[PDB]
Design an enzyme around this catalytic site. Structure first.
Site, short mmCIF file in Angstrom:
data_model
loop_
_atom_site.label_atom_id
_atom_site.label_comp_id
_atom_site.label_asym_id
_atom_site.label_seq_id
_atom_site.Cartn_x
_atom_site.Cartn_y
_atom_site.Cartn_z
N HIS A 1 54.66 66.72 47.17
CA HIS A 1 54.46 66.94 48.72
C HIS A 1 55.62 66.72 49.51
O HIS A 1 55.46 66.74 50.76
CB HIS A 1 53.14 66.42 49.12
CG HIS A 1 53.11 64.89 49.17
ND1 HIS A 1 53.73 64.03 50.00
CD2 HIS A 1 52.40 63.97 48.32
CE1 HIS A 1 53.27 62.74 49.92
NE2 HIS A 1 52.63 62.62 48.87
N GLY B 1 55.72 57.08 55.24
CA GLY B 1 57.11 56.80 54.42
C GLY B 1 57.13 56.14 53.25
O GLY B 1 57.86 56.28 52.57
N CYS C 1 55.34 56.98 50.25
CA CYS C 1 55.09 57.78 49.36
C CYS C 1 56.39 57.87 48.28
O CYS C 1 57.28 57.75 48.73
CB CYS C 1 54.85 59.16 49.59
SG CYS C 1 53.01 59.29 50.50
#
Lengths: 306, 306
Positions: free
Chosen positions: A41, A143, A145
């Site tokens: 993603h 932030g 991930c």
């Protein structure tokens, strides 16, 4: 003496953390040998997350669209591919700090350390468990991930988790390092609700053994039980059924303390039915389930890593 | 979202840990520049610890009696001196992994990360606080002395604790890096008992603010209080008196949540008088006091270290 929620030393993983930016989205990547792993993603805008077609979105991305920064230096992306829900970005430089490592897919009930990171920089380390509903109860902001979970055996880092999603209920979901989500979760901003948060019975028992080794002994009672009778109580309290495999795993702690596993089960049964009456066990006012039998042995024996 | 007991990344400290052996005693040392710091009781046998005369015991030790090993290589000891309760062993090689660092002596109520080590090898990392009675509740076995506690601000490690002693009650005592014990404790195996384990009120309040930021809001009530009225309740429950300095420190969390500090005090007062009624706050069944207001801001804002 003393028993603490203890994470693995994080230095071997710190040296692998990088920042990955694609378009306007920045998150963390894991740099091992000449590959950087990150959540797919990274290619999505916040609008994309509502109904993303990852294969279509990826068509518009070339190698040069993935900006990878290790500290203050760029890495050159020479190839990229999607594997399940992770991207593998091939870079032209092998990470000189790559530790010995493996990728492992863990079972619910197993624990691991998380190195929380933002913009490729480590912020903190803490201990998690894979819950029976395949969520984890972490500490993750925007932030974060691409932050990873890991275990260490001597000098080998076994990576088992990469952070992808926060559910609307504030618990967390992610993948193994092959990109397959734990449980039924998906990398889409949709109604995904977690199932029952069941307590990890074998871990509670291990922690009770840790308490006895440390002098916390007030909950030891005069009773014993059987697996089937205990599990009638486990079910009522949303505890995982205890199996003979679990009994065998607790064998070493039973031997060290001289408390038979089924006697500890009867102590736990009384704690579930009566509560703790305002008392504490190892400084906790509730029954802790995020220490494995292996975690207890390690912390009680001083196992080290080099 | 999510709030976890979070330690600092430990890699900068891992690179400083060495093994120190003198005679038959092995513990950990901290290698910074060309100096290795360790507890002076490395020179004692277990018999010596009952009534040691450190100056006399040290006469029988020369540079070559201190065996210092970084991983698999010796360091050459070229000088040694006693400073308070620590030894400073000058070595002929500056540690190439020395981070930017400072030595700080912390105040009771302040928190820090501990890298527990055995034979110079890191085993785990966890978060501690300096208790109001100048003990810490750690996890330390034989071999762990010389393990250090630290905080990190960006790229600077502030070392604040070195482990020396376990009291007969299972709590822990140690020194700053200048070798001065926290509190009244001494490096002698004698009757040393800790004073009252008082709760760090300003930290409980900070943690309640963390709970609100995370959606745990059930304990917010319709009442307010004053400092003097709250402290009448703080004293009954062995809580540190709250001061205006503490109120000022909580200002930023008050601003972020819109909950006045004295309103949070009245919520805490009700929790102390009524208990939690079997409920939880941030997954805890008791009032947590080992997060500072600064710890809450960092974890809630994603502050990183490089």
């Amino acid at each position: 003496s003393g028993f603490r929620k203890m994470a693995f030393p994080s230095g071997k993983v710190e040296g692998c953390m990088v920042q990955v930016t694609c378009g306007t989205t920045t998150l963390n990547g894991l740099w091992l040998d000449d590959v950087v792993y990150c959540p797919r993603h990274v290619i999505c805008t916040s609008e994309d997350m509502l109904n993303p077609n990852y294969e279509d979105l990826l068509i518009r991305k070339s190698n040069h669209n993935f900006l990878v920064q290790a500290g203050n230096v760029q890495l050159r992306v020479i190839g990229h591919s999607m594997q399940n829900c992770v991207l593998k970005l091939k870079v032209d430089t092998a990470n000189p700090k790559t530790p010995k490592y493996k990728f492992v897919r863990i079972q619910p009930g197993q624990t691991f350390s998380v190195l929380a990171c933002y913009n490729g920089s480590p912020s903190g380390v803490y201990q998690c468990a894979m819950r029976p509903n395949f969520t984890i109860k972490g500490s993750f902001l925007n932030g974060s991930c691409g932050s990873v979970g890991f275990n260490i055996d001597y000098d080998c880092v076994s990576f088992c988790y990469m952070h992808h999603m926060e559910l609307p209920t504030g618990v967390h979901a992610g993948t193994d390092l092959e990109g397959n989500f734990y449980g039924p979760f998906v990398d889409r901003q949709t109604a995904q609700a977690a199932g029952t948060d069941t307590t990890i019975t074998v871990n509670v028992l291990a922690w009770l053994y840790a308490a006895v080794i440390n002098g916390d002994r007030w909950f030891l009672n005069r009773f014993t039980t059987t697996l089937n009778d205990f599990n009638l109580v486990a079910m009522k309290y949303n505890y995982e059924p205890l199996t003979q495999d679990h009994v065998d795993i607790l064998g070493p702690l039973s031997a060290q303390t001289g408390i038979a596993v089924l006697d500890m089960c009867a102590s736990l049964k009384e704690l579930l039915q009566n509560g703790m009456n305002g008392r504490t066990i190892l400084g906790s006012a509730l029954l802790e389930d995020e220490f494995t039998p292996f975690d207890v042995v390690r912390q009680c024996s001083g196992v080290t890593f080099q």
